[PDB]
Design a protein around this ligand. Sequence first.
Ligand code: CA
Lengths: 124, 98
Amino acid sequence: IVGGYTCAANSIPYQVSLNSGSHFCGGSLINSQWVVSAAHCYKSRIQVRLGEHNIDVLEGNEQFINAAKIITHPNFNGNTLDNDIMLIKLSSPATLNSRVATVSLPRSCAAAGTECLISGWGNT
Amino acid sequence: SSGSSYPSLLQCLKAPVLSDSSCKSSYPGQITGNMICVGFLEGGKDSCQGDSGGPVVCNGQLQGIVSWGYGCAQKNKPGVYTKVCNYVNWIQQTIAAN
Ligand SMILES: [Ca+2]
């Protein structure tokens, strides 16, 4: 995130970090067993890190759960990034609490001009 | 772990959904119906490498997944996001059967 601000710790409880030795992508928890992310973040093995704020320091709310299934959209196009969506099944269900929580899927598409919140541990 | 360039602490950004006409004009020949632009045409505020897969949440609903862009926070090159309101049935059916 360029030009952002630091989120209040655990105020984005659906944000997860995808980890293969180090952070490489984000995702969103949509039920206790499933994270939605981008298909171009695919790796054959992924550890999902929930409850994170500082991804370099153990702060006490983390849950580290390895993926059991990783399903990219069948019509993902690696050249154009069309259909860039992926689902990750946790090998055990996350414990939902005040710092690890789900985000609702949309009930309709958002109008142009709608204010949104974007988050991540990407380059600043 | 954040490695050599990523921040340690989770970063946040408020940003508006952009019109499809602005999205297509920013990225001629590259925008499908499964993509939406979110951010600022003047640049300066945007998602970037390491953010992909993460959320764009509007009025409590996941509407976008960080996908791609030209550079980061560049003028007339807003972020391009997977349009989640195209995929609720794919998501729900995949979850239901797996
Ligand atoms: Ca931590």
